[PDB]
């Protein structure tokens, strides 16, 4: 539960003119970055990279270089009904819909992964929709070798 | 010559609609860190010959 | 001429016959 | 004109019996909080395009 | 006239041929 | 076992002229209410809602609004042979047939859910039939994404 | 009239051999406290319409 | 007469063709 | 293991002229009684009942009345290799063949159920064959919604 | 009469080759303490009618 | 004669056609 | 582990002229005896018995009499990688190949069963081949209702 | 964890002129040796042996003699995400890719097996590619009766 | 005689392409310590008659 | 001559028809 500190080794800031909009994470062996978040990621050898991909899932996936295979996190694919965590608190997974406390997310906190317990990345936060006291997430998880994005009713992209 | 041009604007369209259907059917398999389901290796000519 | 415009006239409606079926499936999932 | 009217009272009946069989086969899938079984997405034109 | 009243005359008995089979199944379950 | 208190956040009274007949529960993301129980549910923004549905199962299912997604309970689909509980006592599940003590149910207590242990809703009480010392329930459970109502011999609707 | 009687003593025999084969194939499903296997609901007209 | 005694003459051997097969199965189990 | 006392609530004596031959048990929701054991069961509202059924399994199965649904036992369908019990002692299940000590059964003790641990009925004793120091049972168990009677070599019906 | 004898020495050979193939296909099922796999009950006339 | 020696001449090659296939399977297992 | 004593109730000596060659065991409900080991088994009512069977597996299987059904052992069909035992020591099962210490078997010790822990018979020793410090067994086990004999390279029959 | 000592009984040095290049291991019942590593293995009765096999997997597999069946190790086929070990340290298996510390492998250490906990061999080290602080292995594992070699991007053969 | 030689240089080529496809399809089954998948025993004439 | 060069002319294109399909499968796995 102290192992949220290792996200800084597998995250990068992406800026459009000088201001940070989102984050390009580094799950597994592929740079993932949400397709809406624009700019140039703050890393030279990760900049010159042809990786423009699909937009039905809203991702933009890459292939990481060989000298940065060991700076990556650990991916997994199973999730039980439990208690997961990311940088701005602690979440839970009930019925296929991650929920956070209202106000812990701000417009500009996309690309944040979600760890389970062992520092294993499960999904990618990219949205949110205010139900009231709680708010649920729009999120891009993968069941098994097939990413499927989830979107509740009336979200907006952070 | 117009019939000699209505072929090439009707043989590229049926080749354009295979490259689109090749793309849309296996685009999530390239995004995840995962395999290719080798039945679709046989039917669709997939770019993972076995890599990525 | 009917043989020429019936081959690739029949190729084209089979190329649509795939793409109608593929977008019927992998919009759903 | 009666034959021109016995068509419309015999082409609506065969269209009425598809809307009823479309309704009765997937009415529990709309009541539960659940999915659509995408084979029946292909055969039956289901209102969950993927939603609800 | 037999061609007109044999098409939608044969459409209608296929529309019943579904609904007899569907109510045979999803009354049972 | 103290968590039967949370049913008041996911229940509403429905009256026909001024008297309470049943309850419109709020399981998952869909308002469920038994199709026999009439009137107008005591909530304005849940009143104007087109949701008249099937009658072979005797339900009337809806879609809850977006600002009340976080007032809902938690649904599940598995049930072992054990010891379940609802508002008027404690029940058990033996052989696909919920049973209560005789007289704990009254004509007018429909729409009552049944929790398992974790406050997870399993089914919906809507009937009952006097076997004698015990009485079994008519009930609308769902196995997995398919509601199936159960009805013993000679019931009556509460 | 004998041919008019050899029909009824040869159309009841082929109806007697369906009621026997209907009986013997689903007699254990009525003895246990169990279900009917709804494929055999479709093929054989079973007395559990869904009950017992 | 052959058409009459070939229909229900052919119905009867199909009714035996079920009962030979059913008693071959649900004597075994 | 004290719960063999509840068989008296789900058993009845059947007599042919005034002497007891067997027992009509009351498993689940269906009166089961072995087809060989004759007479009239000692219960009036269970007498007038049309329930003559098959004889390849040697059963005679019924439908219990509505005011006696709560006097029934509990049925199950799984059995591991263990230690089961009935009224005249304690049995074991090894290789699909129940065995008792020799002489614990008498000619006239049919219809006796066999409980597992929780008072769950597994099968119905109706036979027996002397192997020597031990004797095995002819018995009518059900695997899953299909009764299958078992018969060792050279039995006789009690 | 030789043709009347070349039948019986060529109708026993095709009956000998069914009894051998009946034997070799289900000889382990009689050695173990086990069942018969009732599909092969239907196809092959097995001596366990249900016994042993 | 060809009909007689073609029936049980064709029965015999089907009896070998089983035993070649059965000894191909239950030598392997 | 003291329960290797019960093999004497389910074993018999078979002699050819007056000398013991092997053993006809009594697993389950069928007399098993290896087809190579000759003579007449030392039991009169088990002698007059027509049971000559196949030779591809090298067995000769019978049907035990009715008054000796209760002198039999217990058969099973599963085996994990563990520690099994027979009369001349203790064996292990690694990779589908039972192994014994070298010299614990003698030419004339066939028909010996192998128990697991609960006195459940697993297979039948009938061979052996000297690897060196250890030696593996030729053995006739059954996976599930299908006996399959195993034979290593260059054995000889005990 | 002391049981890395038993690799010397199931390993041999192979030399090309007098210098050691690799190792011919002895897993299961088949001599495995990587197809690139040349020379003659330092064992006479294992030299005269016709075993030249495929090169798509880069193996060269044999059949071990009968008097050395008992000098072999133990093979297995399952592997969970855990902590495995070989001669030059301790490795881990995350996402189908064994990793070692950088510099623990040298050009000339092929044929080294990898044990799990019980001294059960899992795979065969034959490569390596420097990611940086860590380096991953090229390796020939078998899922179940089908060897599949794995190769990361830009390796070289040790 | 050239046609009598173009047979043997075209009947060996179709026999060479079966021995190669026999080799490549079952070469991993001989490397591992494992079985042969007896369906491929029936179709392909495999050298493990049952051994190795 | 067409019958001779059509048999083993048609044998050879079936021998390629296996090896194109086998190397399409067991290069992939």
L47 φ/ψ angles, rounded to the nearest 5 degrees? -85, -55
Partnered with residue A120 across adjacent β-strands are A74
Cα separations in angstroms, H20 against D44, G15, G24, H7, J41: 40, 15, 12, 20, 13
| Paired tokens of G33 | 């406290």
Q: Is M64 on the interface with L (CB under 8 A)?
A: no
Residues from chain G contacting residue I123 (CB–CB below 8 Å): none
Alpha-carbon span F77 to F83, nearest angstrom: 16
Alpha helices in chain B (DSSP H): 3-6, 8-11, 13-31, 38-43
Q: Is A30 on the interface with B (CB under 8 A)?
A: yes
Alpha-carbon span A120 to M12, nearest angstrom: 40
Smallest Cα distance from C13 to chain B, Å? 8
Query: Which chain I residue has the Cα nearest residue F133?
Result: I70
Q: Which chains touch L (3 or more CB pairs under 8 A)?
A: I, J, M
**Taking the alpha carbons of M44, M46, M49, M55 in that order, is the dihedral positive or negative?**
negative
Q: Is J51 on the interface with L (CB under 8 A)?
A: no
Answer yes or no: A67 catalytic: no
Alpha-carbon span L1 to L10, nearest angstrom: 17
Q: Is J32 on the interface with K (CB under 8 A)?
A: no
Which runs of E-coded beta strand occur in M71-111? 74-75, 83-84, 91-93, 98-101
Residues from chain D contacting residue E8 (CB–CB below 8 Å): 7, 10-11, 14
Strands A74-75 and A120-124: parallel
Query: Which chain O residue has the Cα nearest residue B39?
Result: O25
Alpha-carbon span L62 to L49, nearest angstrom: 8
User: Coil, strand, or helix at residue L54?
Assistant: coil
End-to-end CA distance of chain K: 43
Domain boundaries, chain J: 3-43
Out of F73, F110, F116, F138, which one is annotated catalytic?
F110
Alpha-carbon span H13 to L78, nearest angstrom: 48
Query: Which chain G residue has the Cα nearest residue H19?
Result: G21
Alpha-carbon span M133 to M41, nearest angstrom: 34
Q: What technique was this entry resolved by?
A: cryo-EM
Alpha-carbon span I60 to I63, nearest angstrom: 11
Residue L153 CB neighbour total at 10 angstroms: 15
Strands A139-142 and F139-142: unpaired
Residues from chain K contacting residue N41 (CB–CB below 8 Å): 24-25, 28
Alpha-carbon span A41 to A10, nearest angstrom: 13
Number of helices and strands (H, E) in chain D? 4, 0
Residues from chain A contacting residue B52 (CB–CB below 8 Å): 63
Query: Which chain M residue has the Cα nearest residue N51?
Result: M63
Q: Is B35 on the interface with A (CB under 8 A)?
A: yes
Alpha-carbon span F113 to F110, nearest angstrom: 9
Nearest to L70 among I132, I153, I154 (CB): I132
| Paired tokens of D47 | 């209102």
User: Coil, strand, or helix at residue I31?
Assistant: coil
Q: Is C27 on the interface with D (CB under 8 A)?
A: yes
Answer yes or no: L70 catalytic: no
- The closest alpha carbon to B13, from L137, N13, C19, F151, belongs to C19
Q: Which secondary structure element, helix H or strand E, spans residue G31, and what is its range?
A: helix G13-31
Q: Is G38 on the interface with E (CB under 8 A)?
A: yes
Residues from chain O contacting residue N26 (CB–CB below 8 Å): none
Identify the burial level of O24 via C-beta atoms within 10 angstroms of its C-beta, where 0-12 means exposed, 13-18 middle and 19 or more buried.
middle
Alpha-carbon span A46 to I49, nearest angstrom: 83
- The closest alpha carbon to M98, from M57, M131, M146, M147, belongs to M131
User: Coil, strand, or helix at residue A156?
Assistant: coil
Sequence-distant (≥ 6) Cβ neighbours of residue E9 within 8 angstroms: D10
End-to-end CA distance of chain N: 45
Smallest Cα distance from B5 to chain O, Å? 35
Residues from chain H contacting residue J38 (CB–CB below 8 Å): 25, 28-29
Mutate to test the interface with D, among F147, F148, F149 (most CBs of D within 10 A): F147
Cβ–Cβ < 8 Å for M46, M12: yes
Partnered with residue A84 across adjacent β-strands are A91
- What are the contacts of I112-115 at 24+ separation with CB within 8 A? I112/I7, I112/I23, I112/I25, I112/I86, I112/I87, I112/I88, I113/I7, I113/I10, I113/I25, I113/I27, I113/I73, I113/I86, I114/I84, I114/I85, I114/I86, I114/I139, I115/I3, I115/I4, I115/I7, I115/I84, I115/I85, I115/I86
Cβ–Cβ < 8 Å for F151, F135: no
- The closest alpha carbon to K22, from A119, J40, G52, O7, belongs to J40
Residue L4 CB neighbour total at 10 angstroms: 15
Cβ–Cβ < 8 Å for L112, L65: no
Cβ–Cβ < 8 Å for I85, I91: yes
Mutate to test the interface with J, among H18, H28, H29 (most CBs of J within 10 A): H28
Out of I9, I17, I45, I58, which one is annotated catalytic?
I58
Three-class SS of A89-109: CCEEECCCCEEEECCCCCCCC
Query: Which chain B residue has the Cα nearest residue C14?
Result: B14
Cβ–Cβ < 8 Å for L64, L103: no
Residue B7 CB neighbour total at 10 angstroms: 13
Sequence-distant (≥ 6) Cβ neighbours of residue M148 within 8 angstroms: M57, M140, M141, M142, N28, O29
Alpha-carbon span F64 to F33, nearest angstrom: 12
Cβ–Cβ < 8 Å for L63, L50: no
Residue G38 CB neighbour total at 10 angstroms: 16
Alpha-carbon span N17 to N11, nearest angstrom: 10
What is the DSSP secondary-structure string of N19-32? HHHHHHHHHHHHHS
Nearest to I136 among L28, L69, L74 (CB): L69
Alpha-carbon span L46 to L58, nearest angstrom: 20
Partner J, chain K 6-25, Cβ-Cβ below 8 Å:
8-9, 11-12, 14-16, 18-19, 22-23
Mutate to test the interface with F, among A96, A103, A129, A132 (most CBs of F within 10 A): A132
I150 φ/ψ angles, rounded to the nearest 5 degrees? -115, 140
Chains B and I: 3 or more CB pairs within 8 Å of each other: no
Query: Which chain L residue has the Cα nearest residue M29?
Result: L95
Q: Which secondary structure element, helix H or strand E, spans residue L18, and what is its range?
A: none
Answer yes or no: F94 catalytic: no
Smallest Cα distance from G49 to chain H, Å? 23
Cα separations in angstroms, M132 against A8, A65, F68, M93, M98: 18, 11, 51, 18, 15
- The closest alpha carbon to M81, from L72, A76, A12, I120, belongs to A76
Q: Which chains touch D (3 or more CB pairs under 8 A)?
A: C, E, F
Q: In what order do the strands lie in the sheet with A74-75?
A: A74-75, A120-124, A113-115
Nearest to G28 among I30, I75, I146 (CB): I146
User: Coil, strand, or helix at residue H19?
Assistant: helix
Chains C and B: 3 or more CB pairs within 8 Å of each other: yes
Nearest to I28 among F95, F129, F153 (CB): F95
Sequence-distant (≥ 6) Cβ neighbours of residue A66 within 8 angstroms: M129, M131, M153, M154
Mutate to test the interface with M, among A28, A70, A120, A121 (most CBs of M within 10 A): A70
Residue F141 CB neighbour total at 10 angstroms: 17
Q: Which secondary structure element, helix H or strand E, spans residue L25, and what is its range?
A: none
**Taking the alpha carbons of J15, J17, J20, J22 in that order, is the dihedral positive or negative?**
negative
Nearest to K24 among N36, N42, N50 (CB): N42
Q: Is I155 on the interface with L (CB under 8 A)?
A: no
User: Coil, strand, or helix at residue I123?
Assistant: strand
Smallest Cα distance from D50 to chain E, Å? 23
Residue E21 CB neighbour total at 10 angstroms: 12
Q: What is the resolution of this structure in A?
A: 3.8
Cβ–Cβ < 8 Å for M62, M14: no
Task: Count Cα atoms within 13 angstroms, Cβ side, for F107.
Answer: 5
Sequence-distant (≥ 6) Cβ neighbours of residue F121 within 8 angstroms: F25, F27, F28, F73, F74, F75, F76, F113, F114, F115
């Amino acid at each position: 539960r102290m192992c949220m500190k290792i996200e800084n080794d597998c995250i990068f800031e992406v800026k459009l003119d000088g201001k940070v909009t989102g984050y390009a994470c580094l799950v597994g062996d592929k740079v993932m970055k949400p397709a809406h978040v624009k700019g140039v990621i703050d890393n030279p050898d990760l900049a010159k990279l042809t990786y423009k991909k699909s937009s039905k899932y809203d991702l933009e996936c890459a292939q990481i270089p060989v000298h940065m295979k060991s700076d990556a996190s650990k991916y997994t694919h199973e999730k039980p009904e439990g208690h997961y965590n990311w940088h701005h608190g602690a979440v839970q997974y009930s019925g296929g819909r991650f929920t956070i406390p209202t106000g812990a997310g701000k417009p500009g906190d996309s690309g944040r992964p979600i760890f389970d317990n062992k520092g294993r990345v499960v999904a990618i936060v990219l949205g949110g929709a205010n139900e009231g006291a709680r708010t649920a997430l729009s999120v891009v998880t993968w069941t098994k070798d097939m990413v499927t994005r989830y979107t509740p009713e009336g979200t907006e992209e952070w | 010559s117009a019939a000699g041009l209505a072929v090439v604007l009707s043989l590229l369209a049926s080749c354009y609609m295979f490259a689109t259907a090749r793309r849309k059917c296996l685009t999530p398999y390239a995004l995840t860190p995962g395999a290719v389901v080798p039945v679709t290796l046989g039917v669709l000519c997939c770019a993972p010959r076995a890599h990525a | 001429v009917q043989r020429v415009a019936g081959g690739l006239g029949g190729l084209t409606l089979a190329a649509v016959a795939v793409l109608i079926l593929v977008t019927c499936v992998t919009m759903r999932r």
